[PDB]
Amino acid sequence: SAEHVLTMLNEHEVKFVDLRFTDTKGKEQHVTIPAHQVNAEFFEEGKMFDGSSIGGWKGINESDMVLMPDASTAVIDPFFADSTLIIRCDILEPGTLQGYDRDPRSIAKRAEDYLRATGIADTVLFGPEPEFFLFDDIRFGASISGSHVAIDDIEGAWNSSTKYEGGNKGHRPGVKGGYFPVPPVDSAQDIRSEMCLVMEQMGLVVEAHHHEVATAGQNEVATRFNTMTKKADE
């Protein structure tokens, strides 16, 4: 609860509350609130902003259901303490529910809870396995006259020939061959290892991490299953 959050607020000092909050038809968003301003009312009636990303004709302000005031935690990363505390869409408004032209987190639940009103069952678990790429430089652009993009990261075969100064040192994974081969060759762990620590710190549960299969920094971190709404937000 808030009563709670409330402590936590003092538990840690914290000021500001933000990073990750709304999240688009696409993905992730935030706004920052001075530490005060939080207080029940806040917990009970929210805060509201407006449109931008899906919205038509003027002024559709949307309540920001300061919510899942569970889904609340100290973000490592930001400077000065602050409780990243999601929000359950903008609820709507006075009706108070599906954020304008979405409420992805809402839809989530409608679904979820709707599920529940069928009887087909009671709880749906989702355990996604998302992989990601970790590179060094990413340059690209496009324009009347041309277009392009370039990717680089010590690793990705390509780089062998490449001259450095501390110079080459040549251990790296060649095209579909980033296969848990031990270090010298493994851009590195510490980045993963590390990501886990924080992942859990943030509150997820890690199950194992490792290098996927790609010449230039394909990394995977696995995370224990959940409930759509939770996992999704995880």
Partner 1 sequence: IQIYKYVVHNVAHRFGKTATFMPKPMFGDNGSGMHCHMSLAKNGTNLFSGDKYAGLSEQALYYIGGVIKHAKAINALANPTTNSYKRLVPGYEAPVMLAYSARNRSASIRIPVVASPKARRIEVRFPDPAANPYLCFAALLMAGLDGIKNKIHPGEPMDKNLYDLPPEEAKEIPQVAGSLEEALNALDLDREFLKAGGVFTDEAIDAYIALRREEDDRVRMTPHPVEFELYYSV
Find the shortest distance in angstroms from Cβ 185 to partner 1.
6
Which CB atom, from 93 or from 220, has the smaller least distance to Mn ion?
Answer: 220
φ, ψ dihedrals at 73, nearest 5° = -170, 165
Closest distance of CB 223 from Mn ion, Å:
12
The answer to whether residue 216 forms part of the interface with partner 1 (CB under 8 A) is: no
69/178 with CB nearer Mn ion: 178
Nearer to partner 1, 189 or 227 (CB): 189
Asked if 133 contacts 219 with a C-beta cutoff of 8 angstroms, the reply is yes
User: Tokens 């199950």 sit at which residue?
Assistant: 207
Residue 234 marked in a binding site: no
Annotated ligand binding at 93? The verdict is no
> If binding is defined by CB under 8 A, does position 5 make contact with partner 1?
no
Residue with tokens 């999704």: 232
* Under rule CB under 8 A, residue 185 binds partner 1: yes
Rounded Cα distance, 224 and 200, in Å: 11
Q: What b/e readout covers 89-107, taking b as 16+ CB neighbours within 10 angstroms?
A: bbbbeeeeebbbebbbbbb
Residue with tokens 């003027």: 58
Q: Which is nearer to partner 1, 47 or 172 (CB)?
A: 172
**Quick one: what does residue 78 bind among partner 1, Mn ion, none, with the CB cut-off 5 to 8 Å set by partner type?**
none
Using the rule CB under 8 A, give the single segment among 13-21, 108-116, 121-129, 179-187 that binds partner 1. Answer: 179-187
H helices of the chain, where? 2-12, 42-45, 104-116, 191-202, 228-233
* Distance of closest approach, residue 218 Cβ to Mn ion, in angstroms: 9
Strands 146-152, 218-223: pairing is unpaired
Name which position in 127, 128, 170, 203 contacts partner 1 (CB under 8 A). Answer: 170
Residue linked to tokens 């998302």: 130
Asked if 42 and 83 count as a contact pair (C-beta separation under 8 A), the reply is no
Contact residues: partner 1, CB under 8 A? 160, 170-172, 174, 181, 184-185
